[PDB]
Design a protein around this ligand. Structure first.
Ligand code: HEM
Ligand code: HEM
Ligand SMILES: Oc1ccc(F)cc1
Lengths: 137, 137
C-alpha cells in the first residue's frame, strides 16, 4: 500500500527520485522551462550533473516525508503551507504539481515494482487541494 | 510437486504466510479494506503487530489443511463450504479468492524456492469453482 510504497522509494531514493523526475520532464517537456540548466540535456547528462542528483534527492526526501505525515493520503496543512511558501516555488501554480503526479503515477503503473498507484493518484489530488487552500493559484 | 510444496510452506509457515499475504495486499491494494487494523501500515510495521502474525499463520494453516485434503488439487466439498460459510468471509466473492491465488502463484514463480506453481494455480481455480458451487457470489 501507500505506506509500504514510501518505504520502497526510501529504500532506493536517489534512483527513484531521478527516474521519476526525468519521467516528469520528459512527459511534460514544457515543464523543463522552470529548470534553467536542465534544458538541452539528455537523461544521462542530467544524471551526471551533481546538482540534478542533489536537488532531485532533496525533492523526494521531502515528498516522502509529506506522504509519511499524511492520513489516508491527505497531507498536513502545514506541509502544504511550506510547499506554497518556499521561495523556490514562487513561480508555481497547482497545475505544475498535477503534472508531476500524473507522471509519477504513470511511472508507477509502468514499473516492475508493485506500487499502490491509485493511492499516489489520490495523494497528488489531495496535495493539489491542500496547495489551493494554502493559497497557491 | 504439490505435496512437497505443502511441506516447504509448513516448514516455515510464519515466513511464507506473511510473505504471500503481503504479496496479495500489495498486488491488490483494494483488498486491504477487509483488514481494518492493517490500513496505513508498511510491511515491516505489520510484522510487529501480534494479530498480523497470528492471523496470517492461521489463514495459511487452514489453506495447507485444505490443500493436503485435496485430491489431484481438487479440494473437498466440505472444505469449500467451510470457507463460504465462515463469519469472517460473509462479504467475500470468489474474485477475492481468485486474487489471493493469482498473488500466491506470482509469489511462487518469483521465488528462489522450486514450487509447483502450476499445481497451485489449478488448486486456486478448483477452489474458486468449489466456492461457486457452494453458493459464493
Ligand atoms: C510534492 C512535490 C514537491 C516537493 C516535495 C518539492 C520540494 C523541493 C525542495 C526540497 C527543493 C529544494 C531543493 C534543493 O535546494 O536542493 C525544491 C526546489 C525547487 N522546486 Fe520543488 N518540490 C515539489 C514540486 C515541484 C514542482 C511540481 C515543480 C515545478 C514543476 C517544482 C519546482 C522547483 C524549482 C524550480 C526549485 C528550485 C530550483 C532547483 O532546485 O534547481 N517543485 N523543491
Ligand atoms: C483459501 C483461502 C483462505 C483461507 C484458508 C482463509 C482462512 C481464514 C482463517 C482461518 C481466518 C481466521 C483467522 C483467525 O482465527 O484469527 C480468516 C479470517 C479472515 N479472512 Fe480469510 N481465508 C482465505 C481467504 C480470504 C480472502 C481471499 C479474504 C479477503 C480478500 C479473506 C478475508 C478474511 C478476513 C477479513 C478475516 C477476519 C480478519 C482477520 O482474521 O484478521 N480470507 N480467514
Ligand atoms: O532541483 C530540483 C529538482 C527537482 C525538483 F522537483 C525541484 C527542484
Amino acid at each position: 500500500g501507500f505506506k509500504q510504497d514510501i518505504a520502497t522509494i526510501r529504500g532506493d531514493l536517489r534512483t527513484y527520485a531521478q527516474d521519476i523526475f526525468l519521467a516528469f520532464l520528459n512527459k511534460y517537456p514544457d515543464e523543463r522551462r522552470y529548470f534553467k540548466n536542465y534544458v538541452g540535456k539528455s537523461d544521462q547528462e542530467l544524471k551526471s550533473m551533481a546538482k540534478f542528483g542533489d536537488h532531485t534527492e532533496k525533492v523526494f526526501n521531502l515528498m516522502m516525508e509529506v506522504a509519511d505525515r499524511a492520513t489516508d493520503c491527505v497531507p498536513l496543512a502545514s506541509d502544504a503551507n511550506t510547499l506554497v511558501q518556499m521561495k523556490q516555488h514562487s513561480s508555481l501554480t497547482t497545475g505544475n504539481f498535477e503534472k508531476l503526479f500524473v507522471a509519477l503515477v504513470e511511472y508507477m503503473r509502468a514499473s516492475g515494482q508493485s506500487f499502490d498507484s491509485q493511492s499516489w493518484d489520490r495523494f497528488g489530488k489531495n496535495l493539489v487541494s491542500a496547495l489551493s487552500s494554502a493559497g497557491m493559484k
